[PDB]
Design an enzyme around this catalytic site. Structure first.
Site, PDB file in Angstrom:
ATOM      1  N   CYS A 135       0.858  -1.182   0.000  1.00 48.12           N
ATOM      2  CA  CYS A 135       0.000   0.000   0.000  1.00 48.12           C
ATOM      3  C   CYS A 135       0.894   1.231   0.000  1.00 48.12           C
ATOM      4  O   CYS A 135       1.587   1.497   0.987  1.00 48.12           O
ATOM      5  CB  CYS A 135      -0.938   0.007   1.208  1.00 48.12           C
ATOM      6  SG  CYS A 135      -1.749   1.597   1.489  1.00 48.12           S
ATOM      7  N   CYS A 138      -0.200   3.975   2.522  1.00 47.22           N
ATOM      8  CA  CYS A 138      -0.048   3.625   3.929  1.00 47.22           C
ATOM      9  C   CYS A 138       1.373   3.884   4.419  1.00 47.22           C
ATOM     10  O   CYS A 138       1.572   4.466   5.490  1.00 47.22           O
ATOM     11  CB  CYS A 138      -0.424   2.159   4.155  1.00 47.22           C
ATOM     12  SG  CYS A 138      -2.034   1.657   3.500  1.00 47.22           S
ATOM     13  N   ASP A 139       2.374   3.458   3.645  1.00 44.50           N
ATOM     14  CA  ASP A 139       3.767   3.498   4.075  1.00 44.50           C
ATOM     15  C   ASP A 139       4.627   4.397   3.191  1.00 44.50           C
ATOM     16  O   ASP A 139       5.857   4.299   3.232  1.00 44.50           O
ATOM     17  CB  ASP A 139       4.353   2.085   4.107  1.00 44.50           C
ATOM     18  CG  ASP A 139       3.427   1.083   4.770  1.00 44.50           C
ATOM     19  OD1 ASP A 139       2.702   1.468   5.712  1.00 44.50           O
ATOM     20  OD2 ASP A 139       3.421  -0.091   4.346  1.00 44.50           O
TER      21      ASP A 139
END
Ligand SMILES: Cc1cc2nc3c(=O)[nH]c(=O)nc-3n(C[C@H](O)[C@H](O)[C@H](O)COP(=O)(O)OP(=O)(O)OC[C@H]3O[C@@H](n4cnc5c(N)ncnc54)[C@H](O)[C@@H]3O)c2cc1C
Ligand SMILES: Cc1cc2nc3c(=O)[nH]c(=O)nc-3n(C[C@H](O)[C@H](O)[C@H](O)COP(=O)(O)OP(=O)(O)OC[C@H]3O[C@@H](n4cnc5c(N)ncnc54)[C@H](O)[C@@H]3O)c2cc1C
Ligand SMILES: NC(=O)c1ccc[n+]([C@@H]2O[C@H](COP(=O)([O-])OP(=O)(O)OC[C@H]3O[C@@H](n4cnc5c(N)ncnc54)[C@H](OP(=O)(O)O)[C@@H]3O)[C@@H](O)[C@H]2O)c1
Ligand SMILES: NC(=O)c1ccc[n+]([C@@H]2O[C@H](COP(=O)([O-])OP(=O)(O)OC[C@H]3O[C@@H](n4cnc5c(N)ncnc54)[C@H](OP(=O)(O)O)[C@@H]3O)[C@@H](O)[C@H]2O)c1
Lengths: 316, 314
Positions: A135, A138-139
């Site tokens: 993702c 997300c990161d």
């Protein structure tokens, strides 16, 4: 019967499940929806959705999915935050065991979506949570002003490469072909970032191994798909975007399935979302491996709600 | 004669969603709108079932956003109406008014039009007491008498839409029982004993009666005996179902009950018609759901199916 019972139960809080909830509430089914681990679905992990018909510009992923939760809530859909880990379809009403409680239903709409595939490499699994991710939103902020790699050649990989382009120092897009299967206007945005920005292409390449020490990924080794030759690439992280696998593991042995996708009746004579078990219906990416759009998942979610209503009315 | 890689027939949810996805694929779509710009939704006051939209969404409001969404991605929107096609030739030739068109791939999404009985008196009083859409002409009959002909979903749910507008609604059906969703018959049956609905089972609309100002009544005929019966109503709503606008395709596309047959299935190319390069989407190929979100979903599939076809040409 400590079990929570309802006429209709919907698994999934994506476009398919939320659209099924709207059409189910308007049919006075009093639907219950189980959100799952990821509230909103895969769309909450992207920043631009410009192919939802009716929103001309400025629509985001979480924006559309918050609008869909409000829409289902406004029609008094019981939205339960739980995760179903075991089901029983050999008894009626159907039984589904969640991490919090157990639920029972006469009709079930399965719209559990899909989750990202992984290559299955040994080094890939070892560096998960330490450089290997699936993702970008997300990161992505971990890699501010650093070199990252993205593996894949589809809509997800190109979008993740374009997203990380504004965060990382260099984005290395790894794909096993010399052409991509993303949308054409995404390819144009990609090629503009290749000629004028910080995106480097690595076509005809496959990921051979993830490299790193005890503090995360320090690089990746690629392999030429035409000559078998290997080469090394210095990156601090690696995002895998090689497709999505449907979330059907809990249904194995109880529903007819092919390559993990729930099989449905389909056809032109109605009852198209009907699975191999009468009274259970599937919608969205859980049963579609050819289109997999938010608008296609929503339409199938509507069909599942209407098919469920016609099934409930046929009962004594 | 104009040419384009992809041609889209229809300006409804299916045609406009196909235009958006086709524009994103560098196909430069051309969309013939038809005589009704926006589709059947432009004849509805409110749309509460389009997923992701707050309260207050109107029919024309959603279709204005769809046209603006297609125009934003450089979709050539041509206000025209096709009346003759030639699918035996390649590229397909479509003969409309003020222009003729040519295309390598065609997406058909011309929607469906509501049926009429075909009576002579029914034809004369059109728009003067006789109509099909109860929404476009529902405000006329506040606290009046109206008649609804039919016995299915369209007729029962239109009889309910008038149960709180008019002083009484006469539901005229040719059979003893009805043929709608079970919860629609339930909303109807309690309004027969406790509400505005009066049932006229085993009856057929014999003639529409009235003067040069509007409908003043209807004559019903017993399907069992043949003897007639007269009613006094200010309007008559014909709700005997819809008909897919596919008259100009008869002979050149495999069809059933007027609906264009498509491949369907779970292995892609679901919108492929019986002629490779021609795809169908929306109410022309769906007689089971007939929803805006369903038609928009099929229009997206038709664009992705058309892109794969056009890509296979090289
Ligand atoms: C990065 C990215 C960007 C994208 N961008 C676009 C775009 O711009 N336009 C577009 O049209 N499409 C886009 N897509 C595709 C789109 O996300 C999918 O078509 C859509 O999200 C699928 O809808 P769905 O409801 O079928 O599944 P999902 O939206 O994935 O919903 C799955 C739901 O099921 C729940 N669930 C799963 N397993 C269980 C369980 N065991 N118990 C209970 N609940 C469970 C999950 O919590 C989740 O909420 C994108 C996808 C990705 C990954
Ligand atoms: C009164 C009413 C209320 C409704 N309310 C709702 C609702 O609240 N929610 C909902 O989901 N659905 C509703 N529907 C149904 C919904 O509008 C349809 O299912 C959907 O709009 C059909 O989509 P489509 O684009 O396939 O066809 P349409 O929307 O009908 O579009 C057809 C288009 O094709 C064009 N066309 C036709 N013939 C030709 C030709 N020969 N050449 C060129 N162009 C042509 C026409 O101009 C038209 O614009 C309603 C329908 C009606 C009649
Ligand atoms: N904006 C949007 O509309 C949008 C955004 C995201 C997703 N989507 C949709 O959502 C769906 C998700 O698609 P996705 O992009 O996640 O995946 P996808 O479309 O299935 O494509 C995955 C890509 O990864 C490559 N790949 C697969 N397995 C591999 C392996 N073992 N090793 C190396 N490479 C591999 C494939 O290459 P090959 O081509 O060689 O197989 C393919 O290009 C798609 O159908 C897409 O249409 C839409
Ligand atoms: N919104 C939707 O479109 C929607 C929603 C949910 C479900 N459905 C499904 O789709 C179908 C929609 O039904 P519909 O009512 O729209 O169309 P339909 O199923 O064809 O029903 C039309 C009704 O009108 C009567 N009728 C037809 N032609 C007639 C004529 N020439 N003279 C007099 N009466 C005539 C028929 O009577 P007979 O019964 O005697 O033929 C029938 O009851 C339903 O069966 C339902 O299962 C649709």
């Amino acid at each position: 019967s400590d079990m929570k019972h309802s006429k209709l139960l919907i698994l999934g809080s994506g476009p398919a499940g939320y659209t099924a909830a709207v059409y189910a509430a308007r049919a006075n089914l009093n639907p219950v929806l189980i959100t799952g681990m990821q509230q909103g679905g895969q769309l909450t992990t992207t920043t631009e959705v410009e192919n939802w018909p009716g929103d001309p510009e400025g629509l985001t992923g979480p924006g559309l999915m918050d609008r869909m939760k409000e829409h289902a809530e406004r029609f008094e859909t019981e939205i339960i935050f739980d995760h179903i880990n075991e089901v029983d379809f050999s008894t009626r009403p159907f039984v589904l065991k969640g991490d919090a409680a157990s639920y029972s239903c006469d009709a079930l709409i399965i719209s559990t979506g899909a989750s990202a595939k992984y290559l299955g490499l040994e080094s890939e699994e070892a560096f998960k949570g330490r450089g290997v991710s699936a993702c970008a939103t997300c990161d992505g902020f971990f890699y501010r002003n650093q070199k990252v790699a993205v593996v894949g050649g589809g809509n997800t990989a190109v979008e993740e490469a374009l997203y990380l382009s504004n965060i990382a120092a260099e984005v290395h897009l790894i794909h096993r072909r010399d052409s991509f299967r993303a949308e054409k206007i995404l390819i144009n945005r990609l090629m503009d970032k290749v000629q004028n920005g910080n995106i480097v292409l690595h076509t005809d390449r496959v990921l051979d191994e993830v490299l790193g020490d005890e503090m995360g990924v320090t690089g990746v080794r690629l392999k030429d798909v035409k000559t078998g030759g290997t080469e090394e690439l210095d990156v601090m992280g690696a995002f895998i975007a090689i497709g999505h696998s449907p979330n059907t593991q809990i249904f194995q042995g109880q529903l007819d399935m092919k390559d993990g996708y729930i099989l449905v009746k389909s056809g032109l004579e109605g009852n198209a979302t009907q699975t191999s078990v009468e009274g259970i219906f599937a919608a969205g990416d859980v049963m579609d491996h050819n289109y997999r759009q938010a608008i296609t998942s929503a339409g199938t979610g509507c069909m599942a709600a209407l098919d469920a209503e016609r099934y409930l009315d046929s009962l004594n």
